[PDB]
Amino acid sequence: MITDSLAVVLQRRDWENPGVTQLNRLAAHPPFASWRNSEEARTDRPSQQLRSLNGEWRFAWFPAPEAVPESWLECDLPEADTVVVPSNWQMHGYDAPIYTNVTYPITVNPPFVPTENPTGCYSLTFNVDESWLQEGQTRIIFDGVNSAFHLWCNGRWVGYGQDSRLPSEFDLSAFLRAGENRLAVMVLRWSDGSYLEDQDMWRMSGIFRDVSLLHKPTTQISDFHVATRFNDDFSRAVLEAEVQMCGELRDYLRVTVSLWQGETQVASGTAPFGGEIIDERGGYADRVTLRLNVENPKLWSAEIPNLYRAVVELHTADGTLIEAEACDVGFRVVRIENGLLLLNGKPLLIRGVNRHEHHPLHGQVMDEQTMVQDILLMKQNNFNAVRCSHYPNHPLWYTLCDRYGLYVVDEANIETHGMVPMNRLTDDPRWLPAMSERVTRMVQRDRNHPSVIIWSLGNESGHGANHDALYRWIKSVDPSRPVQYEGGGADTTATDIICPMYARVDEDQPFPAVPKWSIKKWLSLPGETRPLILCEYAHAMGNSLGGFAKYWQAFRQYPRLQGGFVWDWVDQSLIKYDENGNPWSAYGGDFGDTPNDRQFCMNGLVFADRTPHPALTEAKHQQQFFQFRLSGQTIEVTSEYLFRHSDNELLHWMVALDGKPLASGEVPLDVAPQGKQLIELPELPQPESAGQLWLTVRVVQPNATAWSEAGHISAWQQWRLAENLSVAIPHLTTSEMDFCIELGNKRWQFNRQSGFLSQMWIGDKKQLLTPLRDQFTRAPLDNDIGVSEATRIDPNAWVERWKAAGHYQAEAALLQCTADTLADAVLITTAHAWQHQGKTLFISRKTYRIDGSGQMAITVDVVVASDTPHPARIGLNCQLAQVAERVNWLGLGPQENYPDRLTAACFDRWDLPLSDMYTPYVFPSENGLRCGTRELNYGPHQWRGDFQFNISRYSQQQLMETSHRHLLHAEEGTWLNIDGFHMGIGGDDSWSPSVSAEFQLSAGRYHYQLVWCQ
Amino acid sequence: MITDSLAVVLQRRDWENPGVTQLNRLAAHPPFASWRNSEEARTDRPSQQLRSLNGEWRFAWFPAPEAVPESWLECDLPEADTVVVPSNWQMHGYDAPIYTNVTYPITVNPPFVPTENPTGCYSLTFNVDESWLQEGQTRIIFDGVNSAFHLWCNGRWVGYGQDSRLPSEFDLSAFLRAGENRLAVMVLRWSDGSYLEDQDMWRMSGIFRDVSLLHKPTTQISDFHVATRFNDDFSRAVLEAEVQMCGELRDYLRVTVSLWQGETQVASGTAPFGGEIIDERGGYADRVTLRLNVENPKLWSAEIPNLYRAVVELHTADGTLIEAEACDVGFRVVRIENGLLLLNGKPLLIRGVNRHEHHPLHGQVMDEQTMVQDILLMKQNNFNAVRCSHYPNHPLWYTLCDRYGLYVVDEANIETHGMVPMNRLTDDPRWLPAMSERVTRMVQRDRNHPSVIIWSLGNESGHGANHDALYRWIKSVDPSRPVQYEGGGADTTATDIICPMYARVDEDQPFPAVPKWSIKKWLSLPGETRPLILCEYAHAMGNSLGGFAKYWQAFRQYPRLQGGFVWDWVDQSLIKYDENGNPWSAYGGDFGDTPNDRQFCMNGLVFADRTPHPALTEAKHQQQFFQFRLSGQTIEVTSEYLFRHSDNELLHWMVALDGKPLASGEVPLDVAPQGKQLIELPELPQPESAGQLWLTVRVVQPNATAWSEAGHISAWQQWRLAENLSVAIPHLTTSEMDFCIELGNKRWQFNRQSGFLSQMWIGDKKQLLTPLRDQFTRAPLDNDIGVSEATRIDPNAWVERWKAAGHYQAEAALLQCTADTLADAVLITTAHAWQHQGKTLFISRKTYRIDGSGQMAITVDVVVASDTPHPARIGLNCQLAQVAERVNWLGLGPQENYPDRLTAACFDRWDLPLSDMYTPYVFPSENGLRCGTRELNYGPHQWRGDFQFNISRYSQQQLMETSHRHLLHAEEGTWLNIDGFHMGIGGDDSWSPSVSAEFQLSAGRYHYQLVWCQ
Ligand SMILES: [Mg+2]
Ligand SMILES: [Mg+2]
Ligand SMILES: [Mg+2]
Ligand SMILES: [Mg+2]
Ligand code: NA
Ligand code: NA
Ligand code: NA
Ligand code: NA
């Protein structure tokens, strides 16, 4: 037909009109399956009325919707490939995914999008049974289509949809025919809706969530809401189920709502349709509210995710079932009382993380297995909350969070970050309809999920009146959940929770019109009474999460600081393939996407393959649910659980002397929620030998859980106990070029022109490929770089200050190199000055004392100019000629730890393969540091003292000059960096200096001593 | 083109889709004229860039949009008539206007409308100058089109619009061509928008407001808001003018905002574009806010409508004017403080009325002359506020209210009264977009008008979440005005003001879920702190406004009772024409409209021709701005003005004895706002003659005003002063049939079978056409009938109770008729029983004493059964044979007054033509009563006593059995009803019993005496 033709359908350009967000789309509603059997519904068995169209579809790509041929509406194109649906077509190579953070991927001219609008033409030929078309309603459900789409069925135009992150449903009953049918879906990458979808993520497109057919009866359940009300002590609950119907009303129709705990019916209710009178015209004849009483309900929480099963049966008075829907019900109350967010009467402490729907191979297509993997890892690392950054998630997500026990912030798909000002659209009433659909349809879909405890109005869209309106709309329709929104300063009228992004613990960031106060200060501002939960904090970009412990100290000290959501869970890297077929991880700009925000897509605690970064352990430790205090030999264990007794926890303790165990034991934990348990340690040993005693306690979960295996370690702490302080002569040969010291089969060679230990021999085997030289620089971290780019320098970034000061180009100048034979040792004294453009940045004065035992004692005293940027490190580095399989050390470990991220590390004797001493951050940087190290063993070498170290096959130079980890090549031998001092890594944010003063190397004078021996 | 064709344009049926409220419509904005001269703008002179297309258009009517021929898009139809635009096409006879109140005029199946959808095809061929199309933007403005419409220009489809009551603007620049152009407008009577337009009014359609062309420059003023901020005492003001631009930004662009008081520039400000930073992305580069200081501003109020002129000039830095817009600015603050609505720091007392846009000949087309007439009448009757029931009004309205001084409630065009429940749509998020457009676009249009002091979210649409959302939206965008909304119980979260409809003063109406408490009680409900202003009260349907004084006593006694809006200003009657070309007033059902709400369209204080009903005077008296208290000979005059001194008022006083003046005088009023003035009266006379002294004071405005002529009476009061109490024999001839009494040339004849005075002779001329008989009934008022209809009886209505009790059918039974000659008089004693179906309702026992002076003294004692409904009246009626030109009476007058509506009437000697004793209510009923009457003179007849009376050419029977006033025919002679007692008329509402107990004839025994003589 003429009006079904592309030429007509496309003429109005509905994808460039925010007044048209949909055409012929059905109302939003909770998940439906149209069970015709109540036991199936109760048991969540797969309904035959819900059919999946996921699988092999036909796909053709076009540069613009105009280029689509009319024949596509009737027959599959010859040029059409077979592709899997759901999928993003950028993952199939048709065009490039674009990583941009704030800047829109298109020209900013709303509501218009580029004429070159990549278009994906999907089609599916399928069979429909005669019974479906004989009676009832057959709808098609698109759980996600990015960004917009037109839908044809058998050549006839059905409808149009936007909002990539919520389901779009269309009635096909009048379009289907018994037997073979063809769907034709034209998906546009850009639409007016794209102005509300400016999230900091990969910009992709396609039918990336499930496609289904649902068959319902003519007389059907159209919507149903569950609410739970409680008494003062949660001993009595009322489940209020409001059920709505569509179709023909009849006095024999009945609704039965039954509530099940496993196989046990705990409550039930039956009633005819017809609600109570609500205004002068009457009530809803097509609605009914059942009120079921539940005595001593088992309450839902992230700690104990007790769930009931609500089955909603639409049937006849004589008992014939018309259809059945069902939901998981969690009995919990979420409310803000006197400035505190309470769940079931107790103040929450949100151990949260932001999570994008990202898969390195399938992009933004989510599968159950990846969701479960994420949830398990999160709970195993002491997360209890997740923020749907920044859009409604795949439906299954919420179910899993109901089942496994995670608190969820459900967020509308509204982000206009790229607008100038940020609220240009959100303050414009012409965009209120569009925004409304993104909020309302989210609530209507997800309001029955107990896991969802907070609604969010979106992200980074300023503060406009549309936010206030939709805030109030949510509050009116669902007063069971707080609403939050960070835009416009994080404390606007459109949020019940002060929810700033990257507000620091103690440091104010007074930005014009939207300051980021210190969270502590923020709570106390005149007139402010709300709780404060950071929607984003602790930016985990690369080697980061420095200063995380400061946040958690504050969270625990301040009642109204109820936590936050780390940014973020998983790196948004994508897999590309080398010429040799090898996969490597790619970030912004690696797909020809331009402009792009290069590696800012990788802010995760875990790699895209869900392998953890070191920072994750820090989080786990700071978020652990058991806090410990040592008093003498008494351990006070305090529980931060609100609801569960410690019924699956035992405390293992161990006392060790310089890594050697001396005593241990196990004590079952029996501590009530928010309670204390005192554990008296038996008299620990009094080792008369020298060294520091260390007490380490670990809470172990002996039995498996739904989310953890037996023996899971959930918490730990370490304290220093008592310390007992410790109470042949080398031959020197002097030449014009070097001092040579010989002792047995050991030989040291100091170059007199450079002033450095230039070679060491054991027997005849050289030990150094590069001299032992002072190092004051590190391969910059993403936090060091910030947003600085070779084209657009950011002068306040640490890397730019270091480069401008000449730290990387500083030329060592020999001031002194002298040798002297003592009674039993040889003493080499050196002094160097590092200079740049006439200024002396650093002066190092060293002494090397080589004694009759072969031990070389190195004393290093460094002066740092007060006016030069504080150096990243003060230490030594050399390239060792040997490559050994393993690294042994007495120090903090086992994982990478830095001065502002080492609380989770434990002091012990650690022994790891050399590879585990390199952290493969996709963007290479300084990595692998271990701090608090008293002994390091590598090959025949032993270093002793009190130092930090990293050891790898990659130089700091190579790390600094290589953009991707897959481009690194192991160099000859092994690079050893031994630092007396190392700067913090930061992480409060990764676009401004974030290293706190106490972790900057600002003392001006530094001293450290090493002992190097065989 | 194919896509411009009706077949394509109409295929999507945008008028049955609430997701499509418009296509290609431009943003809403304040009134624009695009002056290219700043003096013109200042002087509000007509801009040549604003051209009117009002005038002769071509029009063709069709029963459905499908029936429109494609040729219409290119050339005018042959069948097309020439019609005036603006117009409603029901007023041109093409189809019928439908009067329905609650029930939708279409089948209720949203969003769908009937397939038979009357369609009006308008077209206009006009000329466009070349300059308009050479550069700049040419838009077409439709200030009102009911209900929806598609727009073509020169055969090409431009756009689509809904919301009949706000302007719809479209850019024609790309469609126009130098010289001759043709607009084609297809207007649909029904659309999805019609579900939001269920106001209790005539349902009409067409282009009923102005159509204009506006030419603006490419670089233009796109929006501008004015705000006024004040200090604690309103001595200093800041005018904050936010100006927005569209087009190309350039650093030489400037905005100048100048403020004028007549010809005097009081303030000015210039600035480049670029607003302050508002969020992280910056500010609005295309906006600028000027902040002008005004010292000692002249404040705007309904009492003193001081206005400034704001001229907004968009120009270059070097001084070239690009364009100029302008507005009237009123400096006033509206805010609710501690439960009180304050204007400029003073609590308002709203003397309000609801006003529909209605004209009896042109329907819903409004002209300036009618608006001015209405405003003048309102102010002359002591109204200071108007509610735009129930939609945004013609723009000019607001301007006039700014100029003349009326407070305005601006109301969104949202009424869903016919839905079941009433909030079915307003609680549905799918209708939130549509509703939003009706609210937002109202605010954007009218927010600069000082007269608008309150926003309303609509009317009779229940309470749904959409209301809460839009309430909050208004509060966010314009916090300068309170928002009110009555739906959902009048005290919901969506209103700042308790704004009930027809809540009574002392009587509760406990309806389920939406009770109408007594307003006094309502204020004091636990937790209630808001002010209470009735959005509708005192239903002026016909002979009504009984009990109005109770409302105003309450308003004055209770601070938080700040008044209300009477329902309503003007009868919504329409003019039809008899076979003889005579015009008559018509109401529901007179156009074949069915179903219809017959006469409920006529609820006005004035007739459709703006002739006043009697009730208006009552309102004027109760709303008067001067209150009086008498103490001895001292009059305390209290001013209820808040802002103005009584600078144009003098008090005239007069003392009169039984209507004869004895003394008078004038005293200038000099009373401050809310102040008191004591006026000592000189020693009033001590007339030793008999009778009651009456003091009457009137406030006269000696000088003309913009709204009143010289000598205007604005207030009055009357008190009783001292009273000095007053300290030939007829021949009887008895026959079997009658007693005959003769005295000189006077003869009385009493029938002994009936027991009534059956004839009276003066000389040989009979005086009676009908005997003098007791009357206990009245032709029912609309308040007596309520909603009762012959098909659907309402048993609690007074008329139905009276009919069921037999009051109208009661048969008089003679119990006694006897005659007796006294010393100097003849005494006739009678006793009658009125009976129905065996029950005696009334018993009348009378004595007629005819003495030697010709005077017939009648004593009447009536017993009323306690269990029969209280009778409407207790009196006598006769048909007098004579017709005299005038009626003289000593009593309350001059206008119709009833026991619960007589405060405004004054006791005096009144003399009016007989016609003025009949009030021509379009729906006939009891009318013309004058109460407190001590003397009545008609022809040679004089009646004396203390009675109420009406006198007319129409019997109560005829009034009762005639549906329209034009169908009344004067009967032979004159019907006189003399009542000892008369029931109240009611009026709190006209669909339930509203006569308060103290005005019901419930005493069971009544006595009254008359003296009838020559
Ligand atoms: Mg659109
Ligand atoms: Mg962003
Ligand atoms: Mg529509
Ligand atoms: Mg109504
Ligand atoms: Na806290
Ligand atoms: Na990022
Ligand atoms: Na009052
Ligand atoms: Na009415």
Residue numbers in the entry:
A (entry chain D), B (entry chain A): 2 to 728, 736 to 1022
Please quote the authors directly:
We report the determination of the structure of Escherichia coli β-galactosidase at a resolution of ∼1.8 Å using data collected on a 200 kV CRYO ARM microscope equipped with a K3 direct electron detector. The hydrogen densities are useful in assigning absolute orientations for residues such as glutamine or asparagine by removing the uncertainty in the fitting of the amide groups, and are likely to be especially relevant in the context of structure-guided drug design. These findings validate the use of electron microscopes operating at 200 kV for imaging protein complexes at atomic resolution using cryo-EM.
We recorded a set of 4949 movies in a single 24 h session from a plunge-frozen specimen of β-galactosidase using a JEOL 200 kV CRYO ARM microscope equipped with a Gatan K3 direct electron detector. To avoid any potentially large beam tilt variations, we used stage movements to achieve the desired defocus for each exposure, thus allowing the objective lens setting to remain fixed throughout the data collection session. The final resolution of the map, as assessed by the conventional Fourier shell correlation (FSC) criterion, is 1.8 Å, as judged by both the FSC value at 0.143 between random halves of the data, and the FSC value at 0.5 between the map and the atomic model derived from the map. Although the map is not yet at a resolution where individual hydrogen atoms are separately resolved, these additional density bumps nevertheless allow for more accurate model building.
